[PDB]
């Protein structure tokens, strides 16, 4: 009751609007790929192990 | 001659036989036999005393 309110009677209405702030978009989508399958399958590379 | 007339090189571009159709990363050293020929022409300006 500490803030200020807005008081309606049976003919009254109440509305405002809000804007959200910028957010990522939702990813909704599955990889086709996997993280240790990004390499050219055809090629040896020129590092060694 | 300080700065004298410069050198001037010339040199056929090598032409590639046929590669292997499996991909290899040694430099390619098969190459058709060529060269070439032409005219050159050259000019030169004398002063008399």
């Known amino acids: 009751e500490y803030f200020p309110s807005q008081m309606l009677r049976t003919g009254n209405n109440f509305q405002f ?7 990522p978009f ?24 | 001659l300080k700065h004298p007339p410069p050198q001037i090189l010339i040199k056929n571009t090598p032409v590639p036989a046929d590669p ?3 991909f290899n990363q040694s430099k390619l050293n ?8 032409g005219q050159v022409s050259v000019e030169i ?5």
């Open chain 1, 17 to 23: 609007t809000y804007t959200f702030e910028d957010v």
């Open chain 1, 26 to 49: 939702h990813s909704s989508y599955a990889h086709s790929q996997s993280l240790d399958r990004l390499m050219n399958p055809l090629i040896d590379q020129y590092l060694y192990y």
């Open chain 2, 20 to 22: 292997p159709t499996t």
């Open chain 2, 30 to 37: 098969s190459f058709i036999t060529q060269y070439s020929t």
């Open chain 2, 45 to 49: 300006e004398w002063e008399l005393q």
